[PDB]
Each structure stands twice: as C-alpha cells, then as structure tokens.
Amino acid sequence: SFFPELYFNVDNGYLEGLVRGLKAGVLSQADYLNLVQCETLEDLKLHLQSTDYGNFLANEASPLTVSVIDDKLKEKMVVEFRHMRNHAYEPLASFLDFITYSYMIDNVILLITGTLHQRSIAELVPKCHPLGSFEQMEAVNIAQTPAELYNAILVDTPLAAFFQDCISEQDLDEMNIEIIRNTLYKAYLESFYKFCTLLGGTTADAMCPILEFEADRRAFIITINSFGTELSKEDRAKLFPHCGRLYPEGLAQLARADDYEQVKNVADYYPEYKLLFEGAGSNPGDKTLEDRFFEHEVKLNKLAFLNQFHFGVFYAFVKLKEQECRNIVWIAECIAQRHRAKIDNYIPIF
Template sequence: MTDMYFNINSGYLEGLLRGFRSGILTSTDYSNLSQCETLEDLKLHLQGTDYGNFLANEPSPLRVSVIDERLREKLVTEFGHLRQQAVEPLSTFLDYITYGYMIDNIVLVITGVLHNRPVRELLPKCHKLGSFPQLELIHIANSAADLYNAILVDTPLGPYFSGCISGGDFNEMNIEIIRNTLYKAYLEDFYRFCSTLGGTTAESMCELLAFEADRRAFIITINSFGTELTKDDRALLYPKCGKLFPYGLAALARCDDYEQVRQVAGFYAEYNACFESCGSGPGEKTLEDKFFEYEVNLNRKAFLYHFNYGVFYSYVKLKEQENRNIVWIAECIAQGQKGKIDNYINIF
C-alpha cells in the first residue's frame, strides 16, 4: 500500500480524524474540571471544549449516568461518520474495531439474563458500537450451543464462537470462558488482518494488539487464582499474538500466585514497569491503571506516523480513556470525594 494510494482512498478521513484528535482534553482541561463543585459546573466547563453543548438538553439535576451515555453517543456518532465514508480496506478495519464491543455486549446480556434481568433493561446498557440485530434474541439461548446455532452463526462473531461451544448450561464460569475465548480468536484474527495490510499500519497495530493480548493474558492468570479453572484450561484462553508468546505464556500457565506473575513480567521491561509501580494502598495506582497508562502512551505514539489505519483504532481507545476520566471526575463530584478526583489518567 503506497502513500499515494492511501491518500486517494483514506487521506480525507485520516485528516478528519486528526481534527477529532485535536479536540481530546488536555491536562489543563482536566485541571479545570477537577475544580468544579457541582455537575452543572462540569457541564459548563465542557461547553468550552470540543464537547460544546452536548449536555444542553439535559434537565437538572444532571446525573453521572446521563453524562456517561452522552459521551458514548458522541463517540458513536463520530465513528459512524467515518465508517459510512470508508472504503476497503479501511471499512473492514473499522468493522474489526466494533467486534470487541460486540463480544462485551453479548456477555453483558447473557450475564444479565442469568440474573433474571429483562432484556429490555439490558440493551440500553450495551455499547452502541457493538450493536447488532440478533442481540435482543440472546435471552432465548440456554447454552453456548443454542447461542451459536440460533443466533450468532450468521454474525461476524460466528467464526470466533465456533471454538467455544460447550453442551452445558450457562453459569458464571463458562460465560467468562466464552468471553475470553472469543477475545482470543478476535485478537488473533485482527492481528493477522493488520499484518496483511503491511506498512506503517502493520507496524503500529501489531504493537497495539500485542499489548492487548498480553494484558489479557496477565489478567486471565491473576483472576483464575482461587477458581475452578485449571492451568491447562487457562492456557487455552491466552491470545497467541503478543510479546509473551510463546515462552511468557508458558510461564504464566504455570503460575500459582500473583508474585509468580510478577516474576514473569520481570522478563519484559515494559510490563515489569507496570507491575513494579502499582499498588493497592490509598493514592497508589492499581495494575489496571498502569496498564491503561501504558496503553495511552502506545496510542499517542500511533499519531506520530502518517498513512496508517492505526490512528483510527488509537483514537477510539483514547476517547474511551477520556470518557472514563470524565465519568471518574463526575462521580467524585457527585459523591463528594474530591480527595480522589485527581486519580484520572492524563492523555495529552
């Protein structure tokens, strides 16, 4: 893919996206938001950013859940505008971005139904980037086989789902196994697709997807301690497209506790830094926070290169982090926990 052909097909959309990127909140914006005393103050400060009047029609008193919903809607609107004008292979690349949200939506609905929640209450909680027509029919499935054969076989997730069918009914354990098996197949497939695109896209996206695969491997391992999941079953859930593959994954599969996971991470400089600087005490950043910080750094770096699709993926991830930051600040204001309000992750 030459630079010339990239600009012919996708140059306008990349330029548009970089315009969107310039509107991402800076450290100064977060400092101003942190000084707010009420959610109405927060709304007023956001009006001075690229968010503009996106909360103008919301009645008082403003709720954090409403802010979260409007933030998602804005991202979905921007992404939808890009997707409608994209041509191959960018259109397929953007579709791949939505598959992760589809997986999360499926698991959310299944889990809700398992706890006797009506589907009509669950669907509004699903991320609209991962919406698809069959989602509202998931409640009729009683097992993974039913879910695949009756609902998901004709969706983009069908090929991923065929590898995690079991005959048993749904329970908390096999739902999480389904989630991680789907993500494993999805990340490996996305990695292969980006590799075939070549050029700067392959360079930036393979690094981003490798980190996502490794992060999932660490989290799966840590969350499996004290559960019925065997080491062999755990190893089957690891995506095999990260820097940990193959030796790091083999070492993780043998781990029995958190300290052994830290020892494995110690062989990889970028991950060792995350584990070494995290903690669980007051004011300390958790491992999840450190992973988010590292992800933000990788996604910022993607914008240093032109003529690549990685910026589209990175923009969505940076906006996700921005949404989490705003919601965190809003929650602290609403709950009167101003002492914790600075525990967000700066992007720029």
C-alpha cells in the same frame, strides 16, 4: 516497505484528516485540570462547554447525574465512530468493524446470559453497547431458546468465526460466561492481529504494538485474577492471546504461575512490563497495575499518531476517547461523592 504514502489518501485520506481533527479535540492536561477544579456536576458541564464537547449536555435535565453524563459521552463517541464508518471504504470499513467486534462480544455475552436466565432478548437489547448493536433480526424474537440464539449468532453475526472455538451450542450452558467471553476475546484479538499484519505497512507497524500490549496485559490480569478462583491453570492458559510478546515460554510461565510474585518474576524478563509491575504498588494510595497498564495503553495510542499513512489512527482515537470519557465520568463521580482526594487518578491524554 509497502509505500502506503502513494495510495492511502486515494480512499482514506479524507478520513485520516477527519479523525486527526477529532483527536485534536480530546481534552488536554490543562482542560483536565480545569474540569478537576469544578465543584458540582453543573459546573462540570459549564467548564466542559468550552472544550470540543460544546453543548452535548445542554439539552438534558438540569439535575445532571453521572449516569446522564456517561450516556451522553457514549452517545457522542458512537455518533462520531458511526459517521466515520459510514464514510469509510472496504479495508478501513473492515478495520472499524474489527474495532466494534470488541463490544459485540460483550453484547452477545449479555444476550446469552439473559437467554439462559429466560429473559426477553428484546428486553436485553437496551443494555447492549451501541457500537456493537445486533441490527440483524435473526438473533431477535428467539423465544428464549439458547440453541436458536446460537444458530442466529452463527448465521447472522460476524462472531460466527470466533464461535468455532466452541464445539456446540451446549457449550453456552456448559461453560461459564466469563470463560466464553475471554475465549471469544482471545479469538477476536488473534484475528485482529492477523488482519493488521496482512494489511502490513504503517498500519501493521503502528497497530501491532497496541494489540501485543493488549495480549500481554490480558495475560497478566487473567493470571492475577484467577488465583483464588476455581479456574484451573490448564483452562486459564487457553485464555491468553497468542499475539503478545510472551508467546514463547512467557505465557507458559504464566500458566504455571501460582502467585503474584511469580507473575512479577515472569514480567521481569520484559523491561517494558517490568516498569509497569514495579510501579504497580497495589497498596492503598498509589497506582494499581490496571492504572499503570492504562497509562501504557494511552502512551501507545498516542504514539500511534506519529505515523501518518495508517489505519491505526482510528483505533487509537477510539481508545483515547474511551479513556477520556472514563476520565470525565470519574471526575464527575469525584465531584458528586465529594472525594476530591482521589480526583487525580484520571489518566491524562495529550
């Protein structure tokens, strides 16, 4: 074993304690029930004020909206993550940067989509996710030139490594943005898994399961969604990350798969995914496959907190708080639309 116990706290111990303290503030099942019992968005804020969230929503206008609540939750998480990153050192700094690459991918996809449609990049900036902000000025004032934007990404963005999967800037106008996004995400997930493995120790032990499940769920959902589309099997198989546990012949069977029944047969070989697919009834009124995978992801991120001397705590906390913000936004949506029947679809955490 790497014996991280000896040296982890030299640099990252204070942040380990800090992130665990932050995780202790994620709403529990009782708090989720209390928020569910509300009647209006104002009452939602009122109940939420008793949790760790506090007065994050007191300043904003009395006529609360789901949009306002969602933006405030996003802003709070961005602030906390930015504080942790600012107080992090080299290895944990790279870990947190890898966490942010996920949103930087979507942001660059937005940038290229707007540019190919001749829209100002500066005017596209506000829609980008805060955690993936392109503070670099090389990819700004591009004059709506896709070639200039590709060069800017390559020169002054951490995505230059993932953009070597493509062959040239003509690929931006050639390939569909979804395929670009998913190729970028495959490369990013593979690099993230490699980095975690190189870190080794408790970090690898507690983090590789999460990335592996991410890869497997990406494979499953890409297969299930590309059935009725023009996305050929050959071009689909290029989008499966190789980190998952399906790499030997599992991804191959999925690539050859031509129906949800075949996808389920492939998933059967792995019991962990077998249960998720069995519970994913997919008919109206019961948990869908995406919801089952969300439950499994939350479970894995929670188990990430049973290890101690590892960076996986930060990724798990970021994902758990993302899920919590999604849950609160969903509860606010149910309150606003008066659809109390489905108000229990939120995936609980802790």
